[PDB]
Design a protein around this ligand. Structure first.
Ligand SMILES: *[C@@H]1O[C@H](CO)[C@@H](O[C@@H]2O[C@H](CO)[C@@H](O)[C@H](O)[C@H]2NC(C)=O)[C@H](O)[C@H]1NC(C)=O
Ligand SMILES: *[C@@H]1O[C@H](CO)[C@@H](O[C@@H]2O[C@H](CO)[C@@H](O)[C@H](O)[C@H]2NC(C)=O)[C@H](O)[C@H]1NC(C)=O
Ligand SMILES: *[C@@H]1O[C@H](CO)[C@@H](O[C@@H]2O[C@H](CO)[C@@H](O)[C@H](O)[C@H]2NC(C)=O)[C@H](O)[C@H]1NC(C)=O
Ligand SMILES: *[C@@H]1O[C@H](CO)[C@@H](O[C@@H]2O[C@H](CO)[C@@H](O)[C@H](O)[C@H]2NC(C)=O)[C@H](O)[C@H]1NC(C)=O
Ligand SMILES: *[C@@H]1O[C@H](CO)[C@@H](O[C@@H]2O[C@H](CO)[C@@H](O)[C@H](O)[C@H]2NC(C)=O)[C@H](O)[C@H]1NC(C)=O
Ligand SMILES: *[C@@H]1O[C@H](CO)[C@@H](O[C@@H]2O[C@H](CO)[C@@H](O)[C@H](O)[C@H]2NC(C)=O)[C@H](O)[C@H]1NC(C)=O
Ligand SMILES: *[C@@H]1O[C@H](CO)[C@@H](O[C@@H]2O[C@H](CO)[C@@H](O)[C@H](O)[C@H]2NC(C)=O)[C@H](O)[C@H]1NC(C)=O
Ligand SMILES: *[C@@H]1O[C@H](CO)[C@@H](O[C@@H]2O[C@H](CO)[C@@H](O)[C@H](O)[C@H]2NC(C)=O)[C@H](O)[C@H]1NC(C)=O
Ligand SMILES: *[C@@H]1O[C@H](CO)[C@@H](O[C@@H]2O[C@H](CO)[C@@H](O)[C@H](O)[C@H]2NC(C)=O)[C@H](O)[C@H]1NC(C)=O
Ligand SMILES: *[C@@H]1O[C@H](CO)[C@@H](O)[C@H](O)[C@H]1NC(C)=O
Ligand SMILES: *[C@@H]1O[C@H](CO)[C@@H](O)[C@H](O)[C@H]1NC(C)=O
Ligand SMILES: *[C@@H]1O[C@H](CO)[C@@H](O)[C@H](O)[C@H]1NC(C)=O
Ligand SMILES: *[C@@H]1O[C@H](CO)[C@@H](O)[C@H](O)[C@H]1NC(C)=O
Ligand SMILES: *[C@@H]1O[C@H](CO)[C@@H](O)[C@H](O)[C@H]1NC(C)=O
Ligand SMILES: *[C@@H]1O[C@H](CO)[C@@H](O)[C@H](O)[C@H]1NC(C)=O
Ligand SMILES: *[C@@H]1O[C@H](CO)[C@@H](O)[C@H](O)[C@H]1NC(C)=O
Ligand SMILES: *[C@@H]1O[C@H](CO)[C@@H](O)[C@H](O)[C@H]1NC(C)=O
Ligand SMILES: *[C@@H]1O[C@H](CO)[C@@H](O)[C@H](O)[C@H]1NC(C)=O
Lengths: 124, 432, 119, 120, 433, 434
């Protein structure tokens, strides 16, 4: 088995098997007051990630599929290359400037999905 | 393809965060830092090359600030010596002239109050020339600046390794590259939560009691072609230094106030002797040759390398200094930088004692270091040097004046702080 | 558009702006900033915990089995979603929202019991 | 009485789980330490349950089988004549083991679901 | 029909919380307010009316406390002046007085300790008579029987720095821009912003200097206009320029009293000893005041006789215009501004000013500050942006003056209130689990 | 079977965390604590026997440490007596003496500071002997060579205010409600609260005042009842009424020391000069001991013979009854309370009592506080709710008053509490699968 960041250097595909170790380690004399602030910051970072998963409807999951298609304008690469040659450190760099576009799309998609469910449920 | 979000993604962003203190009676209040894990996991990473720039490492700044704060906290509750800023009558102590006593130790007497506001006592004490100036009428140098505080007699000054830990969500990266000069990319890395302990050893000119280079001497600098930068040289071997203050000091104590007392040297047992440090000459000369061999790898092996003393500045700039046992020693380095390198062996360095301490290159503070009873013996390792390059065909190097942040920067060259970002996105075959 | 862009608009219009509204949640004087950060967290978690209790966590909207009572208020849906704003609505329901919250907890408890009988 | 169930009669107590959870979450520094501690523990546990694929769910079943090394008990009294306390006293150090298995199982389950949807 | 849950609902409630300080050294220390401002813009809320009872906005109390906290923290590390409470030997400065400051300054001699305990020094210095009280030529400083005294640090300028205040997460600031609105009721034009505009920490009495100007017209604001005991707040739309100077060219001298501890004091005046004073344009003031009266007629009948007069009493800090000009404190007598009845141009109005060096700011006791002297001469140009006035039969008498600094803060903080976001709520619909 | 999980399970573990105060001008910063819950709840914990150990209870340690810290915060921000540490020129006050007061009150002159540092004030005041030591005529304050003395801040109250404590959420306070629970062990009848009953910070020794009473009978609690190095804690069922006084009509005087500060000096006495003393009912005290003795016999295992003797340590803080009456400090001679043996009107014993003005809380070093004098006559009353007694190293054992650790006053009231953390997660075998 691997330690917490032992996934580094693995391919993006291989790294999908280390999602549990990465996620389970989140959140893991007045001059010491910074220690209180540090614990608080760890909490804030954690909660921000949880809210994002919430707004996209991906809460409680390590992986989540969508109803939003991928745009080649963000990145045009072979699927095989993405999962087998690229690692996550390299990959993130290729799509850094599209992060907010993607997030906006994911949230709006979820917003519409929930409304559609409510109407269907109301009908039957 | 479809957009997929992954959580638990192993990726990094460089980060500037605060540091957490961990440890395992002294000026650093180490009992206040939570105990460490004796066997932290070290995770070796494969196929990662990471840029470590020690000159941009903000952990140095945090050590500087915390160490200063601890220093002040140590002294804040200690007794003030304000009542000593009186005039004094002083003559030289000439009882035992061994020719070490070149006007350095003086016998002073003064009028000071104590316990009750109605009473005074005459105090007879000894002072060193370095801290006393003429008004037989003399005054203490510290009366120039803010009030002088006596350090607490039971708080030790021996450096204790301190472990710096990243907060949760962050980690400390370290590289294992041998011959790593602290500025370039380093391909062999691992992750730890906490650093190894680093002792807050304080010194100038010479880097004492740190880590050693692996196999070969390493010369680290921000801009190697500049003559306005300090050069930090890490040795791959220690050299032993034996320091002594061979005078048996009788320490006297008087009350000065409401449960308050002043500690000072009264009588001296034995003849007057000069303090000094001994380093193996042969060991040292081979060590220097190694340093020279490395300098030539940056400057060419068709030149001449000369060593000389620094020039200009105060005691704290021109001499070597260190604390041992709570006493502050200043040592001459003439025997260390008196050679030219062209393509019971021992060096004795004379030393002196100072009583008024003003460290951190600050002003507006003053501390009094009461003396050690008897004789202090001290043993230290030289683990590195601070070099200064000068500005045709040959060149000279001199010891640097020093910056306390360099001591920490040197030990921390191996470490970097990184933020872990568990979310990321990639295209998939899966849709819902 | 924007944070509180729908404030003053109808409940219907505002029902689709829940996103941006939610997205805006989360040296001794310095204690104030620490405290402010901590409090923001406390408020956030109280809402998440309650949604958790009701089985509504993770979503902007959630459906229940609790019927609406005309004894609380009696306004037509043609008036509630179209001619009413959330600010005014909130005022109208201030007398009984807490009753509703208790009822929602009871309904979720029955559902979990029912799930347990099958599980 | 959020702890009205004493750990006794655990069977019946399985329906009070909702209730127990209801109160989750120089004096100035002490209050800060006290409140942040409540937060840390709350999140610690919610995080752990969430990584096992359950969230807001008081009781959930999974795809991990029960081992005899964990329990060789009668299995006939656990709700009616076994206290959650006494059982826990007799946890026999499998807490971490079980938790690891729960994560492994879920990891694979999520992957399987993703692959099925990818097949679509 | 079923009660469903909606989260992220755009509603709010009044709440008590503090505000992040962002500034973009000084007494309002930079390191105390590191945050700057990216300058995000606010959002107008269409169809939202908000009741702002501005008189009750507690953030004014917070401002009061924060400014004093910054004030005191910055003075804590400065050299103390305890050794100055000695018997002084004082006579008058009579040789170079221009027929005004008649015994205004004293020439004092005293036995001060020096850096070494065993040595003493004789010090000669000038004092304003306002800071010196006769003991029975035996004098003491006025604070020696009531408070500590600290010398302000020469490196602190005390020039007011505009601080915006920002809401914490989960909170928002409602800003109403409705024009010609007094600010206590259902203000119909509100936008939501995370931060207020910046307000300078100007300290003053009588007049309100360097604040926000009224849009469109002079406006009079009050909590209860009927009660003459409530202070009346007047906000001008057009500022009145005031030029305040100290004509005396001062020598600054210093001694060392303690261990590395210097003291700064007034030496001889180089030129003529002339009295400090402030000027305003004569017509501008008269036009401005008439505009105020026009607004009084919105609260008072058309034939109410409006009489302006100087304050009837109180100490100097109450009856004169007290302010910080270059670091020294001026006390200007506004009797030339308020001395008219309003029932139906290359010149000026000059007010005489007194100067004090021992400052007791915030009407507190047990603590005092010593303002070190200014070398050379002093010149300040300020904007009168408002007036704080009280009221005392077919007539009404208006006399200038206000209370403590909360009056100043309160007016600048107008148009804002702080509320908590309340995102959770329920409503009926057709969807049933 | 399969493994399933649960959240919100009613189980717990011992844990140590901090306590949060709740309180309802004073010296406990009571106004800095949250208001208390006016309507708290507790639950009987059904079918649980748990264990308590009052000698290992961190709650005791914390309340003790917190009061030390709090005391300093309350006392720190006021004027010192530093300039008052001068030679005193003393004679005895012999003007209005009952002859029990000989040498107790002294009259001394001295030269102290004023608002103007160049001026000095020749003043005189009165002293109580206990705080003054002869230098050789020439006297000094006892603490002149030991500590700085702070003048107690003048608008304070030292009358104990009960402070309630709350667990942080996720934690709970377990209380022992089992009558006659003697500590260190099983308690079959317990209840759980989020916030407990408040405890008054009473500081006294060898008599515990205004604490709790035993529900039915006197109970003795001791970490080790046969350890000759240990004390015993006595919880009485019957409070003993005690009446203490300073039978002198005092005046007070205030003289400026510096720039807005003054010292409160002793002034003089109106009427004559009399000794402080304390009264108890005689039979009540005798019956109280008979009950204590009965409990000790239970521990001895028979109707053995014991003696009650006098305290002998060379310290007022060890042998006298240390008591704060209003704002003044009593050091009463308790010898009339423990002068008997036990073998198988109510005119009081009027214990004589001494008054000290400069005190040293918790017997720590480098600190001191001066208690300003109070004008008028002081009278106070209290309920003795318990005792701290100890024992000596034959067939007859001797018991004596004792215990110099104020922490044990805290321990006694806290004998019934323990803190645990709640453990809401667990697993079980089941017939259910995903
Ligand atoms: C780092 O690079 C090495 C290549 O040098 C990778 O090693 C290969 O891993 C595959 C399995 O994924 C094996 O089948 C190959 O035989 C390995 N190659 C060699 C030369 O042994 C390695 O997986 C990469 N990443 C990590 C995290 O180790
Ligand atoms: C005390 O020591 C000082 C310092 O060594 C002596 O000062 C020197 O005196 C010689 C003459 O004897 C001069 O040539 C040097 O230049 C002086 N040096 C300095 C630094 O001033 C001093 O004479 C000694 N006094 C006694 C009584 O022994
Ligand atoms: C330390 O090593 C690094 C890595 O080599 C040096 O960084 C550069 O290295 C490349 C070759 O790897 C050279 O072409 C560059 O000129 C180097 N300089 C820079 C700024 O990138 C780095 O210069 C070395 N520093 C020292 C102290 O020798
Ligand atoms: C504020 O209220 C006005 C009406 O008072 C809104 O204007 C109407 O908006 C609706 C929705 O688009 C249109 O159907 C109407 O035709 C508009 N005017 C009317 C009354 O016919 C305006 O949009 C509101 N603004 C918000 C969002 O607060
Ligand atoms: C300083 O000047 C003042 C002002 O002239 C002197 O006080 C006045 O003395 C005259 C008599 O010569 C009286 O009629 C005035 O009423 C006094 N004025 C006030 C305000 O009391 C003062 O005596 C002079 N002091 C010194 C030391 O020269
Ligand atoms: C400030 O404006 C408000 C209106 O927004 C005035 O309030 C009204 O005052 C009248 C009395 O003249 C009352 O009968 C109304 O009921 C009040 N209405 C509201 C909404 O409060 C207020 O009087 C004005 N303040 C001043 C000092 O003039
Ligand atoms: C400001 O100047 C006015 C004069 O314009 C002073 O008014 C005095 O008022 C009293 C009644 O209280 C009269 O007896 C005096 O005759 C008036 N003085 C003059 C010169 O007419 C007012 O006292 C001055 N205020 C301050 C603070 O200096
Ligand atoms: C106050 O008077 C002094 C002289 O007593 C002025 O000092 C002059 O400063 C200028 C430079 O600014 C020099 O060139 C002069 O030689 C100085 N002396 C004189 C006599 O001018 C000082 O500038 C004056 N201050 C003011 C504000 O006018
Ligand atoms: C002042 O009081 C002291 C006691 O506080 C007196 O000294 C003692 O007096 C008693 C008799 O009352 C003797 O038995 C002791 O032996 C005396 N003590 C010592 C050390 O000798 C003292 O005599 C009184 N002085 C005056 C003038 O009244
Ligand atoms: C982001 O923009 C910069 C130019 O500012 C460009 O160099 C970089 O490649 C871009 N990154 C991505 C992922 O598009
Ligand atoms: C040095 O000290 C010793 C100690 O007794 C003494 O005998 C000797 O004479 C001294 N010599 C000098 C240098 O005066
Ligand atoms: C102490 O003070 C007296 C004052 O007459 C002076 O003569 C003497 O030299 C002083 N002594 C010392 C040691 O300073
Ligand atoms: C315990 O196990 C035995 C079989 O070994 C069974 O007969 C008995 O009924 C079980 N106990 C209970 C309570 O069911
Ligand atoms: C002050 O003295 C100067 C000469 O030193 C003289 O020119 C000037 O007129 C004097 N001014 C007054 C007001 O006396
Ligand atoms: C200073 O003190 C001396 C006495 O030593 C006194 O004669 C003189 O008048 C004092 N001088 C001043 C300015 O106070
Ligand atoms: C134990 O549980 C039973 C329920 O079966 C209850 O009747 C009994 O009172 C409980 N015992 C207590 C109160 O400790
Ligand atoms: C108390 O003082 C009065 C005079 O005021 C005197 O008559 C009386 O005898 C004195 N009492 C004693 C005990 O000396
Ligand atoms: C006060 O000072 C004078 C000298 O001015 C001295 O004679 C007297 O004894 C002092 N007083 C006391 C009580 O010591």
């Amino acid at each position: 088995s691997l330690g917490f960041l032992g996934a580094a250097g693995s391919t993006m595909g291989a790294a999908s098997m280390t999602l549990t170790v990465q996620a389970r380690n989140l959140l893991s004399t007045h001059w010491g007051i910074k220690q209180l602030q540090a614990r608080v910051l760890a909490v804030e970072h954690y909660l921000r990630d949880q809210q994002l998963l919430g707004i996209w409807g991906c809460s409680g999951k390590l992986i989540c599929c969508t109803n939003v298609p991928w745009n080649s304008s963000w990145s045009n690469r072979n699927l095989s290359e993405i999962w087998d040659n690229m690692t996550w450190l390299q990959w993130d760099k290729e799509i850094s400037n599209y992060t907010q576009i993607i997030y906006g799309l994911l949230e709006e998609s979820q917003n519409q999905q929930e409304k559609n469910e409510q109407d269907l449920l109301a009908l039957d | 393809l479809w957009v997929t979000v992954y959580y638990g993604v192993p990726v990094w962003k460089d980060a500037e965060t605060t540091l957490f203190c961990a440890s395992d009676h002294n000026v650093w209040a180490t009992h206040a830092c939570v105990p460490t894990d004796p066997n932290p996991q070290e995770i070796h990473l494969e196929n990662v090359t990471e840029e470590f720039n020690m000159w941009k490492n903000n952990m140095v700044e945090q050590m500087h600030e915390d160490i200063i704060s601890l220093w002040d906290q140590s002294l804040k509750p200690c007794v003030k010596l304000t009542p000593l800023c009186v005039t004094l009558q002083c003559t030289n102590v000439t009882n035992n002239i061994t020719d070490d006593m070149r006007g350095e130790l003086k016998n002073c007497s003064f009028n000071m109050t104590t316990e009750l506001r109605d009473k005074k006592q005459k105090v007879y004490s000894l002072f060193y020339r370095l801290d006393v100036v003429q008004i037989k009428e003399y005054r203490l140098i510290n009366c120039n600046t803010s009030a002088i505080t006596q350090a607490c007699p039971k708080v030790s000054f021996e450096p204790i390794p301190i472990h710096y830990c990243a907060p949760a969500g962050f980690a400390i990266l370290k590289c294992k590259d041998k011959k790593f000069n602290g500025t370039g990319p380093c391909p062999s890395v691992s992750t730890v939560q906490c650093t190894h302990g680093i002792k807050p050893v304080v010194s100038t000119q010479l880097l004492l009691n740190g880590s050693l280079a692996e196999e070969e001497v390493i010369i680290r600098s921000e801009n190697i072609t500049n003559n306005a930068k300090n050069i930090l040289v890490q040795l791959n071997t220690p050299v032993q230094i034996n320091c002594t203050r061979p005078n048996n000091n009788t320490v006297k104590s008087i009350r000065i106030g409401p449960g308050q007392a002043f500690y000072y040297t009264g009588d001296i047992i034995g003849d007057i002797r000069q303090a000094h440090c001994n380093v193996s000459k042969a060991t040292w000369n081979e060590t220097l040759g190694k340093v020279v061999k490395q300098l030539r790898k940056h400057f060419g092996n068709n030149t001449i390398i000369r060593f000389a003393q620094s020039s200009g500045g105060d005691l704290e700039v021109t001499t070597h200094s260190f604390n041992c046992g709570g006493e502050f020693f200043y040592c001459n380095t003439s025997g260390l930088f008196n050679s030219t390198w062209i393509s019971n062996d021992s060096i004795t360095l004379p030393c002196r004692i100072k009583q008024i301490i003003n460290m951190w290159q600050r002003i507006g503070q003053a501390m009094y270091a009461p003396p050690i009873q008897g004789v202090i013996r001290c043993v230290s390792n030289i683990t590195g040097l601070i070099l200064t390059r000068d500005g045709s065909t040959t060149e000279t190097f001199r010891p640097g004046g020093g910056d306390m942040r360099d001591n920490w920067r040197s030990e921390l060259y191996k470490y970097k702080v990184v933020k872990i970002e568990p979310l990321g996105v990639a295209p998939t075959r899966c849709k819902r």
